[PDB]
Amino acid sequence: GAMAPSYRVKRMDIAKNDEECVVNAANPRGLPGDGVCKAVYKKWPESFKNSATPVGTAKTVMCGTYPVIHAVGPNFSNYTESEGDRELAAAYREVAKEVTRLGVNSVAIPLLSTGVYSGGKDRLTQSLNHLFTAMDSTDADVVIYCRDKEWEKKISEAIQMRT
Ligand SMILES: CNC(=O)c1cccc2cc[nH]c12
Ligand SMILES: [Cl-]
Numbered sequence: 068g069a070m071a072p073s074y075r076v077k078r079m080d081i082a083k084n085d086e087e088c089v090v091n092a093a094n095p096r097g098l099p100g101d102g103v104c105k106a107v108y109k110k111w112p113e114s115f116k117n118s119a120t121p122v123g124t125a126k127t128v129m130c131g132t133y134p135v136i137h138a139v140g141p142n143f144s145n146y147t148e149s150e151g152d153r154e155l156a157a158a159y160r161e162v163a164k165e166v167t168r169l170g171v172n173s174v175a176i177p178l179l180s181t182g183v184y185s186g187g188k189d190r191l192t193q194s195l196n197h198l199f200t201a202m203d204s205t206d207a208d209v210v211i212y213c214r215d216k217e218w219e220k221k222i223s224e225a226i227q228m229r230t
Protein backbone atom coordinates (compact mmCIF):
# COMPACT_ATOMS: atom_id res chain seq x y z
CA GLY A 68 0.00 0.00 0.00
CA ALA A 69 0.94 3.69 -0.14
CA MET A 70 2.52 5.13 3.08
CA ALA A 71 -0.16 7.87 3.31
CA PRO A 72 -2.79 7.05 0.69
CA SER A 73 -3.80 10.23 -1.19
CA TYR A 74 -5.95 11.63 -4.01
CA ARG A 75 -4.41 14.02 -6.58
CA VAL A 76 -5.54 15.49 -9.91
CA LYS A 77 -3.42 16.28 -12.98
CA ARG A 78 -4.44 17.97 -16.25
CA MET A 79 -2.49 15.98 -18.83
CA ASP A 80 -2.59 12.91 -21.13
CA ILE A 81 -3.16 9.73 -19.00
CA ALA A 82 -0.78 7.94 -21.49
CA LYS A 83 2.04 9.99 -19.78
CA ASN A 84 1.04 8.89 -16.18
CA ASP A 85 3.61 8.25 -13.38
CA GLU A 86 1.57 5.50 -11.65
CA GLU A 87 1.96 1.69 -11.37
CA CYS A 88 -1.19 0.96 -13.46
CA VAL A 89 -3.81 2.72 -15.61
CA VAL A 90 -7.59 2.58 -15.88
CA ASN A 91 -8.89 2.82 -19.46
CA ALA A 92 -12.33 4.39 -20.10
CA ALA A 93 -13.03 1.39 -22.39
CA ASN A 94 -15.87 0.40 -24.67
CA PRO A 95 -17.52 -3.02 -24.11
CA ARG A 96 -16.02 -4.50 -27.35
CA GLY A 97 -12.32 -3.88 -26.76
CA LEU A 98 -12.16 -1.51 -29.79
CA PRO A 99 -9.56 1.30 -30.07
CA GLY A 100 -12.37 3.85 -29.61
CA ASP A 101 -11.78 7.62 -29.23
CA GLY A 102 -10.52 10.09 -26.57
CA VAL A 103 -8.88 8.41 -23.54
CA CYS A 104 -9.52 4.94 -25.01
CA LYS A 105 -7.62 5.74 -28.23
CA ALA A 106 -4.69 7.29 -26.24
CA VAL A 107 -4.52 4.03 -24.20
CA TYR A 108 -4.68 1.98 -27.48
CA LYS A 109 -1.71 3.94 -28.95
CA LYS A 110 0.40 3.57 -25.74
CA TRP A 111 -0.51 -0.01 -24.68
CA PRO A 112 -2.00 -1.76 -27.76
CA GLU A 113 -0.99 -5.23 -26.46
CA SER A 114 -3.48 -4.70 -23.57
CA PHE A 115 -6.43 -4.91 -26.01
CA LYS A 116 -6.05 -8.72 -26.44
CA ASN A 117 -9.40 -10.16 -25.17
CA SER A 118 -10.24 -6.93 -23.30
CA ALA A 119 -13.97 -6.95 -24.27
CA THR A 120 -16.15 -6.93 -21.10
CA PRO A 121 -19.71 -5.85 -20.26
CA VAL A 122 -20.96 -2.46 -19.03
CA GLY A 123 -20.40 -1.99 -15.26
CA THR A 124 -17.30 -4.30 -15.21
CA ALA A 125 -13.53 -4.03 -15.38
CA LYS A 126 -11.09 -6.45 -17.03
CA THR A 127 -7.29 -6.21 -16.55
CA VAL A 128 -4.86 -7.08 -19.37
CA MET A 129 -1.06 -6.75 -18.93
CA CYS A 130 1.10 -4.77 -21.45
CA GLY A 131 4.42 -6.38 -20.49
CA THR A 132 4.22 -6.17 -16.70
CA TYR A 133 2.21 -2.86 -16.79
CA PRO A 134 -1.50 -3.50 -15.91
CA VAL A 135 -4.26 -1.81 -17.98
CA ILE A 136 -7.65 -2.03 -16.20
CA HIS A 137 -10.36 -1.71 -18.90
CA ALA A 138 -13.38 -0.17 -17.05
CA VAL A 139 -16.63 0.06 -19.06
CA GLY A 140 -18.90 2.91 -17.97
CA PRO A 141 -22.47 3.20 -19.35
CA ASN A 142 -23.23 5.39 -22.38
CA PHE A 143 -26.01 7.73 -20.98
CA SER A 144 -27.30 8.08 -24.61
CA ASN A 145 -28.63 4.46 -24.16
CA TYR A 146 -29.21 4.03 -20.40
CA THR A 147 -31.89 5.75 -18.30
CA GLU A 148 -30.43 8.17 -15.69
CA SER A 149 -31.35 5.57 -12.99
CA GLU A 150 -29.80 2.46 -14.63
CA GLY A 151 -26.80 4.42 -15.91
CA ASP A 152 -26.12 5.73 -12.39
CA ARG A 153 -26.14 2.07 -11.08
CA GLU A 154 -23.77 0.84 -13.87
CA LEU A 155 -21.36 3.81 -13.38
CA ALA A 156 -21.14 3.06 -9.58
CA ALA A 157 -20.61 -0.69 -10.40
CA ALA A 158 -17.73 -0.02 -12.90
CA TYR A 159 -15.80 1.92 -10.21
CA ARG A 160 -16.42 -0.86 -7.59
CA GLU A 161 -14.83 -3.37 -10.10
CA VAL A 162 -11.85 -0.98 -10.57
CA ALA A 163 -11.28 -0.99 -6.78
CA LYS A 164 -11.33 -4.84 -6.75
CA GLU A 165 -8.75 -4.98 -9.58
CA VAL A 166 -6.44 -2.33 -8.05
CA THR A 167 -6.53 -4.32 -4.75
CA ARG A 168 -5.92 -7.73 -6.45
CA LEU A 169 -2.90 -6.31 -8.42
CA GLY A 170 -1.16 -5.06 -5.21
CA VAL A 171 -0.16 -1.76 -6.87
CA ASN A 172 0.70 1.25 -4.68
CA SER A 173 -0.68 3.81 -7.26
CA VAL A 174 -3.27 4.02 -10.08
CA ALA A 175 -4.02 6.59 -12.84
CA ILE A 176 -7.79 6.98 -13.44
CA PRO A 177 -9.99 9.08 -15.74
CA LEU A 178 -13.60 10.11 -14.86
CA LEU A 179 -15.79 7.38 -16.44
CA SER A 180 -18.84 8.39 -18.56
CA THR A 181 -17.84 12.15 -18.63
CA GLY A 182 -16.92 12.41 -22.38
CA VAL A 183 -18.62 10.74 -25.42
CA TYR A 184 -20.64 8.53 -22.96
CA SER A 185 -22.06 11.55 -20.95
CA GLY A 186 -25.27 11.83 -23.07
CA GLY A 187 -24.38 15.57 -23.37
CA LYS A 188 -24.59 16.29 -19.58
CA ASP A 189 -21.93 17.55 -17.11
CA ARG A 190 -21.28 14.44 -14.92
CA LEU A 191 -18.06 15.62 -13.09
CA THR A 192 -19.68 15.44 -9.60
CA GLN A 193 -21.65 12.20 -10.28
CA SER A 194 -18.62 10.34 -11.73
CA LEU A 195 -16.11 11.68 -9.13
CA ASN A 196 -18.39 10.78 -6.18
CA HIS A 197 -18.75 7.19 -7.48
CA LEU A 198 -14.92 7.11 -7.85
CA PHE A 199 -14.53 8.14 -4.20
CA THR A 200 -17.18 5.64 -2.94
CA ALA A 201 -15.21 2.77 -4.57
CA MET A 202 -11.61 3.94 -3.96
CA ASP A 203 -11.84 5.33 -0.39
CA SER A 204 -11.36 1.80 1.14
CA THR A 205 -8.26 1.12 -1.06
CA ASP A 206 -4.73 2.13 0.02
CA ALA A 207 -3.35 2.95 -3.46
CA ASP A 208 -2.36 6.55 -4.27
CA VAL A 209 -5.07 7.62 -6.80
CA VAL A 210 -4.16 10.21 -9.48
CA ILE A 211 -7.17 11.46 -11.46
CA TYR A 212 -6.42 12.66 -15.05
CA CYS A 213 -8.49 15.33 -16.86
CA ARG A 214 -8.17 17.71 -19.89
CA ASP A 215 -10.34 20.76 -19.02
CA LYS A 216 -8.85 23.63 -16.93
CA GLU A 217 -12.19 24.33 -15.11
CA TRP A 218 -12.61 20.56 -14.38
CA GLU A 219 -9.08 20.44 -12.89
CA LYS A 220 -10.05 23.26 -10.45
CA LYS A 221 -13.38 21.58 -9.50
CA ILE A 222 -11.81 18.12 -8.96
CA SER A 223 -8.99 19.71 -6.88
CA GLU A 224 -11.62 21.61 -4.80
CA ALA A 225 -13.60 18.38 -4.20
CA ILE A 226 -10.46 16.50 -3.04
CA GLN A 227 -9.39 19.32 -0.62
CA MET A 228 -12.97 19.70 0.83
CA ARG A 229 -12.55 16.16 2.37
CA THR A 230 -8.94 16.69 3.74
C1 LIG B 1 -7.13 12.21 -19.17
N1 LIG B 1 -7.57 12.40 -20.55
C2 LIG B 1 -6.80 12.03 -21.57
O1 LIG B 1 -5.71 11.51 -21.41
C3 LIG B 1 -7.31 12.27 -22.97
C4 LIG B 1 -8.63 12.68 -23.21
C5 LIG B 1 -9.08 12.92 -24.51
C6 LIG B 1 -8.24 12.76 -25.59
C7 LIG B 1 -6.91 12.35 -25.40
C8 LIG B 1 -5.78 12.15 -26.25
C9 LIG B 1 -4.74 11.81 -25.45
N2 LIG B 1 -5.14 11.77 -24.14
C10 LIG B 1 -6.47 12.11 -24.08
CL1 LIG C 1 -0.30 16.27 -21.81
Ligand SMILES: [Cl-]
Pocket residue numbers: 092179180181182183184185
Ligand atom coordinates in the same frame (compact mmCIF):
# COMPACT_ATOMS: atom_id res chain seq x y z
CL1 LIG D 1 -16.65 8.76 -21.72
Ligand SMILES: [Cl-]
Pocket residue numbers: 213214215218
Ligand atom coordinates in the same frame (compact mmCIF):
# COMPACT_ATOMS: atom_id res chain seq x y z
CL1 LIG E 1 -11.83 16.84 -18.59
